[PDB]
């Protein structure tokens, strides 16, 4: 039997000898870590591929159980049911929490009352064997994805003396815990300076810069439109302006901001932070709060003295409001925008952007679980999206939640049908008032209502920090729109501890751009976001990106059926980069400013400079040459030509208007660099190459396209390798390539994706060969083909080798 | 190659295969806490024979390193050292902790800084291959001994894939973490119910209260727990005329707040000494204000006197409604009615004690006995057990006066405040001295006498002298096992000198009477189960000595026996029958029958009745009845007794296992009864005995069960056989479908031996060879008949009582003197096979 035959294999490695390449999925007996191979995706992966399930988790986090949510209801669809069982050890489980239990329909749960319960143990049964996670981590986003946590995954046949002693004492509490209803909850319910880190260090850095260039208006763009005001106060505390005015549209955002700088600053209470709302006139304050509709009516901009503050914050809603009131004159002019879809205000100068992938790392953003689910009429469409929201749920204790439609007779509508059976659903849109807008944004910070409708007031308006939850019901219009909206929820506050977004997926054309602005990935690879889009989740910190298994193929048909090079898009592409400088840009304008990167722009066009003609062999070339660094020989040794075999490689392969060429030359050879070193630091593992960028003397490049749905992988250690067909099984065929793998020289293995082209070929690294009974022959049909099982030299790690065995 | 098919073996029983049996001991295994396994067992197992370990742990408490502590220091000496990581994760990983893994010579303590360290990992690498366990157990001693935890234990190769992760894994955050300094830790700067025991005690109460009798008497061995259970009998029936007496003082304001917490009514007395309470129908008096110029002339002579062990006596004349005493003695007053007895293991189950860390030390080698060395190796040693809390506030009992105060001016010229408190002490000395300690003005007080101290904060109990009794240990350990806010537990440190009464630990720790040596020994490898926090520890030098002090005496002299039968029947006040001494803890009746052939020997022997014919009848119903082994026997005497039916349609009605029946037949057979019973001194004895089956039984067996020591006789009684033999089986014996097999193990050339949990190798007797008369019958039988019974007895135990672990059978290859591997099919238990492997 082969399953004994691979247990027997996995077992000797996991506990004999590893260096021995085994040949099976089952039982390597991996240790769980949190260092880029989280805790939560093995966890996931034996929900995904498991016919029942028991944990056995002492402490459940409503946070951690939204990691497992998607999963588990693809799986109650799939008919796989499962146990949970908890305890009520040290009160710390909260009813809100046990409430999100019962919706999980598929999973049984019961409650135990042994004397402290500290149990963290996971099953999966499968078809034919087990699988079992035992350690330190909890069922809490902090166990699951970021800590230092111990567990091991045991793999095991269903006859093993560990299972036998496991399931049994499962079963003992569990025949004598008590099952969870709505009953029970009811009875549970009676009875010091900070210092900027790295995004800001480097943002304040670059603020630095335009300041000691001799400049006085620089600008400040946050995809999200957050993150802000805490940034600014850093800058703010290193010049130590005599005086300072932080201007804004929005009062509620004003307060909170002052709030916010008093923390960063320790100055007294009274004598430098004075409000100038419609109540408020502490016009000798030194640090100075003020909208522009107080600075604005009545010319109170003039009782100022002008040139009196040395520093002065707009938020560039409040132009063109004010015009007029742009006539101080301070030392530093500093703007801050949510992002446009379109500064000329601010002589074109950008200090930083915030990206939202950048941001979450810096830990400045509220976490989020992003929920992407399936199926504008009213009626189906009410009843399925109340059922859907409901399992998902909201973050706090009380639902406060802004939901994005396509139309505003959508939104209007859906707010009285919602209305009915207890959502409270009030609709906001651009035809209505500031006093109304006003008076229902009040509403729902006071929970006075739990949702507001809209479609278009998501740019520098409705800035509500106290949102649990964000619903999307709209076509994702752009990659900005889509963040600016998710922006709305990730501002930091007290009710909440995280932020469930539940995005509603349809037939829509663009669904591609969903998993486009999640991650930073300008370059436009579909493999790129594919990976991204499928168990790629390791590089978050505590948020989470799940699918349902529908709305995934959904977003996969529409990334394949959709064009990314077309000539609309690059054209928009580089209006876009135009208004970021008010030029017309080289290439790097496409790289700082994260639009569109430069290897998208030759794969629908040979030059930039053609694409610029529609509205030669040099550039082609020369980009083609140095587009991409490839160890830096050329880098080095071409840049000393411009003004020891891989040097030699580097001359014969560059061997083998004019001063606007030169300018041209520049953007190109340095976008060559930029990209080298991002890249490919100074034949890089677990990378992308193509044969051109790569059985020879000391070579043996083997190039796979995974399509086993053929060349298969048999574990993370080894594959079958066919020949070409009618290879001879013997002489020249073979015993080279018997000879190669056994002795001398060494094998390179890539592998693609099926749906993957030319320039994407993942190295996996080094490889051999069995060398015992790794021969075959071929069908009756066919021309003979050999077979062999070989050794790689370094185990595939899980994220590669999930999204390549599909 | 023979690590490798044991290893094998292993794996595949683990991860493959339940039921397939294996050489070596190298089963994954599922670390829970249980009453029967814990998890701190398997991990000082592991600590005990690696060559390394290291620990990569989040959370350590003082009171788990205590139990490591013994190990740890053991494994010093051996040139054995370890790593400890670790990581104040949430914030609190108090000071002192640090200051105690300070102390740990041998170990190497890092501390990383890493967002949210929380691994626990335990590595053991021995020379041959490595341990690990991996799991929800952080070094605290709830997590080690209480909480329903899940480790896995993995034992591994040297060249295993899942230890190169974790070894890998721990280096590269060791590295990156700072070594534990004393430097570093000064520079941190940051900011009503009834017990189920109480259902005995009012039980016992209540039966009293049944009665006419109006007085009783509760023995704490200890001497703690006493205020919570009278308030609780207080409160049953209220006689509005109460009335506390006690000796001591500081204990008045305590049994007072007390009382006051399980009854709920308003405060309105106590009258400690020109003190004006004197009303409200519930006084706290000492004796010493009542004594003092006749104070008992205040009130009428007629609800619910309760008093002392040394509480004048003219005070205690006048006559109420439930008159009772709380004692801690070795009463004679009180009608001799004991109404409950509080014994160290019940006293420990219900949670009224202070968790405790005993620990058994080697006395120094070569005053008589205070000199510099003496002097400087206490203080090396209780230091490294330190106390329990922040500040030190010890006790310390020394053999003789002198010894106390000399030893308290040695002690405190090193820079440890002690003064000593002897009995030729004045009493307001005493009371300043010993609130001296109660303000932690000083930190320890030694005494020879005093065991006048009750001081509820009491971190250390050290002790510099033989143990006296069982009765004296027990109470000198009490000084601490009072709870208090300032302390989490009590450790004490017990200093095992050349004395030979150091068999007296074992005996008073276990409280077994039943005085086998197999038993005490047992309580000394491994005390896996002792429910609760607590742990009992030993040095290895000094737990020989122990072992040495058991070997040399015996626990069997006539003197002894005699000494209890004289003790018994002072609790008693009237001559005690075999049931009063179970009933009152004394020896088990074993014990007398163990050197006196009955117990109407006894009596007469050291001051008759149809003496020749009544002797053996005593001697056999002793064996007949006393073990109380197969209940039926016992309950058949009982129907001939009273029913004298039809020959076996009597028989038959009892089945309302017939071959069960007739042997308890046979066993009485194999008309001068009714002689016997005329006469009634043997009707009485008969009364008696018969009792003594049953209570002996249905504890020991009605609750031929699973680990536990069975006889040669007991077995063939057990199993219906025609013969009860027992010179008849030998090594190897086989009936019909039956084999039971007796082994004295004792391995340390060609002998019995454990191969594994469920594989040992079985001999023959004297080199019968090959496929000879009888092996072949036995691998047959095995194949095809008996289901082979199997005994396990140790080497230093005598009696003929071995261990039964379930039934066995030879393994088809294993036929390779006749030596055979033979697979036991329920694999024997942990504390058993520690035990029983030495």
Redesign the interface.
Known sequence: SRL?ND?NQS?H???????ISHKGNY?????V?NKNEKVLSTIIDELQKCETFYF?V?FITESGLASLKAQLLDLSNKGVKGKILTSNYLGFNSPKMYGELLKLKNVEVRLTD????????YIFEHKDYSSMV????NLTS??LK???????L?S??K????????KS?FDL?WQKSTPLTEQWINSYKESVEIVPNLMQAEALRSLKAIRDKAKDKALIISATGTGKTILCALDVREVNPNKFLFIVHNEGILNRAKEEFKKVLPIKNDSDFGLLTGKHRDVDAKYLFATIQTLSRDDNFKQFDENEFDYIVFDEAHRSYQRVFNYFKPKFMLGMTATPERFELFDYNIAYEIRLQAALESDILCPFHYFGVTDLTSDERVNYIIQKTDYYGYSGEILQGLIFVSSKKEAYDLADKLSSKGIKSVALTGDDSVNYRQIVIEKLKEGKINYIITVDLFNEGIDIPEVNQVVMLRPTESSIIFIQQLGRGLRKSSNKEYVTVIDFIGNYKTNYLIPIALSGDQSQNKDNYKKFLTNNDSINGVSTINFEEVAKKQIYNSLDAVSLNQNKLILKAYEEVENRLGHMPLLMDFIQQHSIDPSVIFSKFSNYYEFLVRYSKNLVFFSRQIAPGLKRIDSLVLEELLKIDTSLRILDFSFYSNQTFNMFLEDLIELSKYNNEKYQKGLILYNKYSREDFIKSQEMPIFITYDKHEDEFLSQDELKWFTKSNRTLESKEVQKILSHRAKGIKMYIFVQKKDDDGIYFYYLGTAGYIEGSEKQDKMPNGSNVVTMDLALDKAVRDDIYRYLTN
């Open positions: 004994l247990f077992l490695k996991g506990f004999i000898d590893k260096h039982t390597p007996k991996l240790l870590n056995s002492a042994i004397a402290g319960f500290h149990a963290k143990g035992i350690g330190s981590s902090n166990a970021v800590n230092y946590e111990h567990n091991v045991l095991t046949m006859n093993g003396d560990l299972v036998d002693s496991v004492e509490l």
